[PDB]
Amino acid sequence: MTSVGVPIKILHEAEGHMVTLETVTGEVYRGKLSEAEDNMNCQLAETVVTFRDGRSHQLDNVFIRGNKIRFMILPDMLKNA
Amino acid sequence: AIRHAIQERLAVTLCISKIDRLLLELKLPPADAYFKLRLIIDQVNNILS
Amino acid sequence: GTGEFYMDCVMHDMRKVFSEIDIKVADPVVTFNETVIETSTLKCFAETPNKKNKITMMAEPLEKQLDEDIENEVVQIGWNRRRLGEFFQTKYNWDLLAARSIWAFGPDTTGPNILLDDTLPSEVDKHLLSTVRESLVQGFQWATREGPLCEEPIRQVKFKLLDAAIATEPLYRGGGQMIPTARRCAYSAFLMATPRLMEPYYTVEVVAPADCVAAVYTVLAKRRGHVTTDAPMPGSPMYTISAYIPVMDSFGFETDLRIHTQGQAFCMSAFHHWQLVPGDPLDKSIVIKTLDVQPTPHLAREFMIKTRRRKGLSEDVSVNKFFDDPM
Amino acid sequence: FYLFDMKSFFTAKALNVAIPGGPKFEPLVKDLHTDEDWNEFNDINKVIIRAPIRTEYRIAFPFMYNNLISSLPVQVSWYHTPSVVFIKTEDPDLPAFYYDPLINPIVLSNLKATEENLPEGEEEDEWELPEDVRPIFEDVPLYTDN
Amino acid sequence: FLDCLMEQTHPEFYRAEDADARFTDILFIEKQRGCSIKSQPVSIVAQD
RNA sequence: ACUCUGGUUCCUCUGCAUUUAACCGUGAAAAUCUUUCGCCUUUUACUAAAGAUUUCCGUGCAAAGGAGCAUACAUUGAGUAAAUUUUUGGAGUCCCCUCGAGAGAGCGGGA
Numbered sequence: 001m002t003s004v005g006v007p008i009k010i011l012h013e014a015e016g017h018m019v020t021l022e023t024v025t026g027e028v029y030r031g032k033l034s035e036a037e038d039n040m041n042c043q044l045a046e047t048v049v050t051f052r053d054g055r056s057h058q059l060d061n062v063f064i065r066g067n068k069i070r071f072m073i074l075p076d077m078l079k080n081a
Numbered sequence: 082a083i084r085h086a087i088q089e090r091l092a093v094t095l096c097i098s099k100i101d102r103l104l105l106e107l108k109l110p111p112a113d114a115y116f117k118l119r120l121i122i123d124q125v126n127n128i129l130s
Numbered sequence: 131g132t133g134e135f136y137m138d139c140v141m142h143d144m145r146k147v148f149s150e151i152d153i154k155v156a157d158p159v160v161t162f163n164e165t166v167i168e169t170s171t172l173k174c175f176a177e178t179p180n181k182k183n184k185i186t187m188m189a190e191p192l193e194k195q196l197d198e199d200i201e202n203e204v205v206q207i208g209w210n211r212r213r214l215g216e217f218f219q220t221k222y223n224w225d226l227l228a229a230r231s232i233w234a235f236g237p238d239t240t241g242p243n244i245l246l247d248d249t250l251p252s253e254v255d256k257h258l259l260s261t262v263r264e265s266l267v268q269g270f271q272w273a274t275r276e277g278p279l280c281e282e283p284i285r286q287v288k289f290k291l292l293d294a295a296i297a298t299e300p301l302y303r304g305g306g307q308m309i310p311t312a313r314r315c316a317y318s319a320f321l322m323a324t325p326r327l328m329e330p331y332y333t334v335e336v337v338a339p340a341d342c343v344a345a346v347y348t349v350l351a352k353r354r355g356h357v358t359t360d361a362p363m364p365g366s367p368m369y370t371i372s373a374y375i376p377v378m379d380s381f382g383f384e385t386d387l388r389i390h391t392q393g394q395a396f397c398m399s400a401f402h403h404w405q406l407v408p409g410d411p412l413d414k415s416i417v418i419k420t421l422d423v424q425p426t427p428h429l430a431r432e433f434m435i436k437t438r439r440r441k442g443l444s445e446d447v448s449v450n451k452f453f454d455d456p457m
Numbered sequence: 458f459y460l461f462d463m464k465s466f467f468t469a470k471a472l473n474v475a476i477p478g479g480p481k482f483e484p485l486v487k488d489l490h491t492d493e494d495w496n497e498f499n500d501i502n503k504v505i506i507r508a509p510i511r512t513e514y515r516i517a518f519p520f521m522y523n524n525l526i527s528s529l530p531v532q533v534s535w536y537h538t539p540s541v542v543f544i545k546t547e548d549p550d551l552p553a554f555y556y557d558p559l560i561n562p563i564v565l566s567n568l569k570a571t572e573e574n575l576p577e578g579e580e581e582d583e584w585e586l587p588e589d590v591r592p593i594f595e596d597v598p599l600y601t602d603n
Numbered sequence: 604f605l606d607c608l609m610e611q612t613h614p615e616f617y618r619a620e621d622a623d624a625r626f627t628d629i630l631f632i633e634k635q636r637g638c639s640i641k642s643q644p645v646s647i648v649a650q651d
Numbered sequence: 652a653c654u655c656u657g658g659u660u661c662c663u664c665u666g667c668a669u670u671u672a673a674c675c676g677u678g679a680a681a682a683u684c685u686u687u688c689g690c691c692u693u694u695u696a697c698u699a700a701a702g703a704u705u706u707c708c709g710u711g712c713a714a715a716g717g718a719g720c721a722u723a724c725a726u727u728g729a730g731u732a733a734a735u736u737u738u739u740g741g742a743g744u745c746c747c748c749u750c751g752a753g754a755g756a757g758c759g760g761g762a
């Protein structure tokens with residue numbers, strides 16, 4: 001690929017693993033990042049959604065638009081990458 | 082190798098290798114070098130099918 | 131070992147890596163297999179040492195592909211009633227009333243020989259026959275591994291069983307009496323069926339163009355090999371030849387070919403067929419002397435006699451004792 | 458070179474056998490003529506000589522054929538090199554890349570041609586390559602007189 | 604071909620200009636014969 | 652923004668060229684010790700092979716210093732310079748209910 005910035009490269013290395021991301025509406029999604037994009041659209045699988053009141057539900061697949069993601073907690077091994 | 086890999090139920094992929102032999106040794110032009118590569122792929126698919 | 135280069139490398143590691151001692155190496159040799167080429171012209175009976183039981187078997191030569199299928203495990207004996215019956219009719223358009231009978235392969239569960247029960251059910255009940263069945267199968271398996279001409283494995287023989295004399299004895303008769311008796315039955319069945327040796331064969335792939343084709347045919351003709359492929363290898367100046375050659379003759383072949391070609395050719399060898407050694411192992415008119423060439427009929431007899439001598443057996447076959455006086 | 462390089466002559470020396478047209482040496486172990494006793498292993502009633510296992514095979518393989526290979530410094534020749542098929546061209550006016558008639562034609566008559574999943578016409582034919590995208594060496598000639 | 608995967612991941616991996624390094628042909632019989640004679644495994648991290 | 656240096660060539664010094672499958676040498680000598688064949692009214696000088704060691708004709712790279720020929724400041728090791736949906740050109744403010752002195756929060760409601 002073209003030289004996209006290091007945070008986007010680390011996001012694609014995060015595809016193997018579990019990531020936890022919060023959306024601008026406040027819901028926290030934990031799941032296994034199956035595809036990511038350079039606009040940081042995220043596809044999660046085996047997802048658990050946690051609502052802002054602390055309720056939770058399972059979701060088989062979730063697509064989140066990249067500009068609606070606030071942050072992602074990435075796994076630690078990516079610090080080595 | 083292909084046949085035994087199928088029987089194992091491996092997943093089979095092809096890599097055509099020492100392509101340089103076409104230009105340097107055989108000196109096939111560009112067009113005939115494509116046909117030689119095409120025939121190799123056909124041979125393997127003939128085994129697979 | 132596979133062929134030539136495997137045994138060189140194995141023996142290199144033996145000398146250099148692992149053993150580091152003064153080993154003597156015999157000249158290389160193939161294991162043979164023993165096969166029938168006819169249906170047994172008699173049904174051959176064997177009576178147990180106690181005379182209370184009688185077994186009768188005939189040997190037949192196996193359906194031509196089926197030993198590859200068994201040794202590959204395209205068919206497996208655990209599939210016995212439904213799936214094994216279906217396999218034999220669908221592939222072979224076959225015996226299927228008798229294919230349901232089969233219940234055993236020998237000399238092991240992947241061995242290239244089959245035992246059938248062909249007793250018509252009026253003669254003995256299936257429970258009594260089921261009691262002896264496990265005993266007879268061990269007898270048939272023993273006979274196919276060790277037994278006949280030169281004590282090489284039997285291959286490509288189908289045995290049929292058809293006898294009923296079984297008595298009130300079951301503990302005493304079942305182990306001791308029946309199982310040695312089933313082996314003599316299989317031998318006498320096998321020995322009536324006109325027996326032959328099989329040797330194993332290589333397939334060869336060779337690449338060099340104008341002069342080397344003629345050299346390939348020459349070197350094969352010296353070593354009983356025969357050719358059938360003549361390919362003008364597409365987009366290459368080489369021709370590709372393929373040939374069958376018998377492993378017992380192959381040992382020089384790679385070095386002979388590269389010398390006579392001057393390295394222009396190279397050949398690799400792979401194995402897949404068993405084929406029948408020319409001649410008759412039992413022909414007493416052939417006398418073998420090691421100082422001289424022993425070409426077409428003598429080949430089977432030499433291979434048997436020298437194999438017996440190597441094993442250390444008696445020089446000529448038991449067959450008068452295995453048929454015995456009654457048969 | 459196959460039975461005639463370096464390693465074959467080294468092995469030939471250690472084995473104490475000649476190669477036709479190669480060098481010969483003093484025996485490396487002078488005892489071996491004294492050992493000869495014929496009967497017990499060697500007996501030849503037992504073994505099936507289909508062809509004479511004579512010199513060249515003992516030099517090519519060593520360890521499959523030779524006794525005593527632990528005092529003897531047998532060495533292993535390079536097995537094979539894939540034959541270079543360069544055909545010299547004698548007409549200097551030919552193109553540098555050309556289909557030499559000694560090269561067999563690229564055809565196998567029975568061979569089923571693989572399915573090519575090319576893109577289907579109607580939308581995909583409109584697709585166009587940007588006007589400055591160009592083969593990497595477009596105007597460099599495929600070959601020169603060098 | 605595996606020597607190329609070695610050369611990319613390693614940097615220190617010397618390949619001669621004359622002859623193949625054949626890193627996965629570790630045995631000395633394989634060095635001398637130069638055919639590969641036994642399998643050998645590699646494990647490497649590599650990018651798509 | 653900082654110290655850092657002219658190219659090229661040549662000489663001489665210093666270091667390393669043991670993980671040998673293999674090779675400082677795509678070439679190829681001689682000697683010593685130990686051991687095994689053949690010449691000999693004696694010893695050397697020898698024949699032709701092995702193992703252990705040296706000598707000799709060469710060798711590679713790096714670094715350092717110097718000396719000569721034609722002459723130029725940049726530049727190495729250390730580091731700069733795009734308002735129309737997914738970021739870098741506002742879907743933002745205000746006005747009620749809740750907890751609380753206080754100021755924030757509730758997929759809160761609304762203009």
Ligand SMILES: Nc1nc2c(ncn2[C@@H]2O[C@H](COP(=O)(O)OP(=O)(O)OP(=O)(O)O)[C@@H](O)[C@H]2O)c(=O)[nH]1
Pocket residue numbers: 098099100101102538539604623625637638639640
């Ligand atoms: N001309 C040409 N020769 C190549 C090329 N790649 C490898 N070879 C040659 O082919 C020979 C074998 O290469 P290897 O890597 O040992 O091939 P290999 O298949 O791994 O050997 P094995 O696995 O034991 O069969 C060597 O002489 C290589 O120089 C190539 O790209 N061009």
